[PDB]
Structures are given as C-alpha cells and as structure tokens.
Amino acid sequence: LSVEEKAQIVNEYKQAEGDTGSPEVQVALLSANINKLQDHFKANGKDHHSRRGLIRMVNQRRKLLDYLKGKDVSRYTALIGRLGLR
RNA sequence: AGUCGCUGGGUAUAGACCCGAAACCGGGCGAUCUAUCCAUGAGCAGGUUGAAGGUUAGGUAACACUGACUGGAGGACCG
Ligand SMILES: [Mg+2]
Ligand SMILES: [Mg+2]
C-alpha cells in the first residue's frame, strides 16, 4: 500500500483526533490492504510464503472487532455498516 | 503280270452307333428383392425417473462448501 493511500484513510475515518491509534483507524487500514492483495493471488497461485502474510492480517482484524464490541455497540455497527463486513 | 473300274470287310481324318456331365472362355442383361451410401420427406399412445445448471438463504478474506426453490439430461425405465 502506498503512502498517500494511507493518508487518504486516516483523514477519512479519524475520530476527530489527528491520531492513528484508535481501532476505527486500525481496522480501516487493514481492510483496504486485504482487498488489494486479492488479485495478486489470482495471478500468483503457488505463492505460498506470501499467502502466510495475508492470514496474519485477517486474524488481526477479527481481534480488534471483538475488542470494539467488548466496549461499545454504537461504535461497532457504525463501523461494520460503513465497510460492509461479517 | 500287272493296272483301272464296281460291290463287300477293314483303316486314317472330320461330332463318326445314340443319349448323358461337373466345369472353362467371349459379347451382353439385371441393385423394382437384398447389401452398404446419397438427396428430400414423416412416424413414435401413454406413464415414470430425475443430472448439469440457475435462483435465493447460510457460509468463506475470497473460492470452499450447505439448504431450499426451480430445472428438464439420457445409445435412461415400464408400455
Ligand atoms: Mg434403379
Ligand atoms: Mg432401390
């Protein structure tokens, strides 16, 4: 993922902060990066050592959602529907 | 003492006392039956079975894979 494509996302899903630590910043950065790789793995089929890196990012994303659900519900469904998951 | 007739018995060559093969060769006739092919036609009551596919619900990062609804394949099944 590029540098300005990171800066496009942090500007968008900022929690009126200027700050990159909140889960709505972190979940957004991972989800844009999984969608980019899906055509790398339709050309490269036998790329197994890079398949291993993608499953790290998927499992990291389901851990931050349950932390988000384990605190609030209003912040949760305002983020699930804004990305279209589950 | 031989020669040319005539009438008889033989012999040679021609179907050669009469009847009787299976086969072989040469010009034709035939695919209105039957054996394949070609062009143009039509014939097969009824009653079962239920493939692939598709839709949608779940499902998965995605493809997996599940269910339901449909669907109408076969040198398929009874008749
Ligand atoms: Mg004829
Ligand atoms: Mg004929």
Side-chain angles (χ1 to χ4, degrees), chain A residues 26-44:
Chain A
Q26 294 176 356
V27 173
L29 292 176
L30 298 175
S31 295
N33 202 2
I34 299 170
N35 292 316
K36 179 173 70 69
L37 289 173
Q38 290 292 320
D39 288 331
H40 183 274
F41 291 97
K42 291 296 184 290
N44 289 316

Side-chain angles (χ1 to χ4, degrees), chain A residues 13 15 24 68 73-84:
Chain A
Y13 289 165
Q15 294 289 107
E24 289 85 6
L68 187 64
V73 182
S74 67
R75 296 178 66 185
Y76 181 73
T77 59
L79 184 62
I80 302 301
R82 197 172 65 184
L83 297 180

Side-chain angles (χ1 to χ4, degrees), chain A residues 4-29:
Chain A
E4 289 83 5
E5 296 295 325
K6 291 179 183 179
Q8 189 66 43
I9 298 169
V10 177
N11 291 316
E12 182 177 358
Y13 289 165
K14 187 184 289 186
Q15 294 289 107
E17 294 175 353
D19 298 325
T20 69
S22 64
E24 289 85 6
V25 177
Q26 294 176 356
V27 173
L29 292 176

Side-chain angles (χ1 to χ4, degrees), chain A residues 21 25 45 53 58 62-63 69 80 83:
Chain A
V25 177
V58 174
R62 289 191 296 113
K63 290 183 180 180
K69 185 184 285 187
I80 302 301
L83 297 180

